[PDB]
Amino acid sequence: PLIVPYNLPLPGGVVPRMLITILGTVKPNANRIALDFQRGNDVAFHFNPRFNENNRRVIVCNTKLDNNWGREERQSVFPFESGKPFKIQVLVEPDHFKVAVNDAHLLQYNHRVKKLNEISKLGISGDIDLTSASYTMI
Numbered sequence: 001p002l003i004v005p006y007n008l009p010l011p012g013g014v015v016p017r018m019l020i021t022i023l024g025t026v027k028p029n030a031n032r033i034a035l036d037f038q039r040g041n042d043v044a045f046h047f048n049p050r051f052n053e054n055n056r057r058v059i060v061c062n063t064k065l066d067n068n069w070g071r072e073e074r075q076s077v078f079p080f081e082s083g084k085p086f087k088i089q090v091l092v093e094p095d096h097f098k099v100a101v102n103d104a105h106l107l108q109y110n111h112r113v114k115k116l117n118e119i120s121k122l123g124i125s126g127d128i129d130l131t132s133a134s135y136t137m138i
């Protein structure tokens with residue numbers, strides 16, 4: 001019921017206590033998913049599950065500043081499975097984004113972009129059927 005890629009506006013940016021919830025299902029034979037928290041053309045937080053990087057499943061996280069990718073943060077805990085429904089929750093905390101998948105903590109990503117109130121869009125893309133994308137204050 002949502003079209004991918006999907007853009008979710010984050011009015012006034014993000015702030016600590018904001019909880020973003022994404023519900024969807026991974027397609028069969030998926031190759032990738034991506035969440036991109038944007039500050040204009042900059043990517044404050046890219047969260048990128050990769051289903052076949054050299055026959056390994058990995059989650060890659062990074063920031064893009066002035067069109068340049070920085071230092072990648074990689075996690076080999078990989079909770080996604082092709083064909084299966086998922087829930088991604090991203091909780092903004094003071095020093096990091098905190099990510100849980102299917103109610104299990106996955107990773108944290110330290111704020112590199114510091115102007116949280118300018119991170120005003122979330123792009124959701126990749127090999128998913130997207131069911132809902134929303135936010136609340138915790």
Ligand SMILES: COc1cccc(CO[C@H]2[C@@H](O)[C@@H](CO)O[C@@H](O[C@H]3[C@H](O)[C@@H](NC(=O)c4cccc(OC)c4)[C@H](NC(C)=O)O[C@@H]3CO)[C@@H]2O)c1
Nearest residue numbers: 032034046048053054060061062063069070071072073074
């Ligand atoms: C595929 O469709 C897309 C649509 C829209 C946007 C994007 C963006 O993809 C980009 C984004 O995910 C970025 C995050 O760091 O990594 C880019 O890929 C990176 C490799 O991950 C990055 N790969 C690795 O470092 C690597 C590979 C295997 C194991 C390992 O362990 C440390 C590391 C590669 N680095 C080098 C030196 O080639 O440089 C590429 C270009 O910057 C993606 O092209 C892709």
